[PDB]
Amino acid sequence: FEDFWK
Amino acid sequence: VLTQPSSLSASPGASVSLTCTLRSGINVGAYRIYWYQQKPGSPPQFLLRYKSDSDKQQGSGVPSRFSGSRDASANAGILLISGLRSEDEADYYCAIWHSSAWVFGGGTQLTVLGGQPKAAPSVTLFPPSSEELQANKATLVCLISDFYPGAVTVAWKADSSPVKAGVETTTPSKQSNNKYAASSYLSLTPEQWKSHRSYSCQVTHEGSTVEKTVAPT
Amino acid sequence: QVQLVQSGAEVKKPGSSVKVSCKASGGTLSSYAISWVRQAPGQGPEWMGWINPNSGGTNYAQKFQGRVTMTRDTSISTAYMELSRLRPDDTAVYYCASGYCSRTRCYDYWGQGTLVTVSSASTKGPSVFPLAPGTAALGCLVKDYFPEPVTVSWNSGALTSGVHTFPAVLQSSGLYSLSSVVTVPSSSLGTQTYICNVNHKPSNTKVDKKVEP
């Protein structure tokens, strides 16, 4: 999954 | 970098488009736009993010009537809300990753028109208490209750002349019964308060004015 | 991936520093970044930076470099944001947040927020004055206290109908003032007793004032 705040 | 209209109003059931306009030069096509909803007292809640019909992500538990889109002509991202409801009344914020800093728009306050019956305000004007006067201060308190929609105009008069200085009015907020209330204060010295025959608090709501008056004892 | 619980409200003088905490509910933070976002009253969010909870590496927003410090405890249980040389304009609600995304969804985990009030004013209990009164309105004027909040009840909580406590107004002195009103039947005014119970917890002050014609 993908980091939201980066 | 981002520009949102500060306020927007619409009727229940309407389809509303909220715009997030990016500064001239910063091309809207090369950014993924984030959208948040915030209700008073709570943190922002992520609604969705949109880059294209291809790459779009919906927030957890966010109804489908919230959708994203783009408007390249005006260099703006778009949040579409269809089937507008009273519970959609909130602040909506957009955001992008630009020049290695998260940048937020100023927010759009969304008001739903006609969510409940029209309610004229109840207005009570209190004079300074004798206790406060013995402390060499005088505060006239005008309390406005049970009104909808949540917009009033407050005017103060000394005798029949308008007052400018010393007036502080709170922004309307919701009561426990979901109508609105507001307070307004006129701050005077005891000498000013006794130097007039009367003071008045005038509340205009949807074209109808309610005047209340007090006088020194 | 985990719920975040923040520390309580802070009240500070200009020049001082504040340190807010952001603890994982569950004992361990996740690997995803913890971002710090603040929001001045009546304004929109403002990103301050993030920290990576495993590395401890930071990325500070330009406006806060040299003023903000973001750390983690060694058990990776709690994240911290420290802000120094505070000014009144640092007054805001400070949030921590973390999240992740599928290709279809995103899941944002926000703390409840921590209010940081920066002011030159000093802790001060309120002065309460009666607002004396078919329905009739009566109330209490709660003057010149700091910081927020004040709570008002009526007759020790036994009278809740028609009660509204209004938002506070910032005074020239940097103190606050508010009113609480209650609408009662006018026939009751002769016999029933009405006492407003003002509680200012930051100063451990309680004021109970009878309102009377």
Author numbering:
A (entry chain B): 11 to 16
B (entry chain L): 3 to 219
C (entry chain H): 2 to 134, 142 to 221
Study authors write:
CXCR2 is involved in neutrophil chemotaxis, which normally follows inflammatory stimuli.
The major epitope of abN48-2-IgG1 was also identified as residues 13–16. Phe14 and Trp15 insert their bulky aromatic side chains into a binding site cavity. Gly95H hydrogen bonds with Phe14 amide nitrogen, while Tyr34L and Trp96L side-chains hydrogen bond with Phe14 and Trp15 carbonyl oxygens. The snug fit of Phe14 and Trp15 in the antibody cavity also facilitates hydrogen-bonding from the Ala33H backbone nitrogen to OD2 atom of Asp13, whose OD1 hydrogen bonds with the Trp15 amide nitrogen to further stabilize the peptide conformation. Specifically, the Phe11 benzene ring forms face-to-edge π-π stacking with Tyr96H, Glu12 salt bridges with Arg32L and Arg49L, and Lys16 hydrogen bonds with Asn52H and packs its aliphatic region against Trp50H. Thus, Asp13, Phe14, and Trp15 are the major contributors to the epitope of abN48-2-IgG1 on hCXCR2, while Phe11, Glu12, and Lys16 play more auxiliary roles.
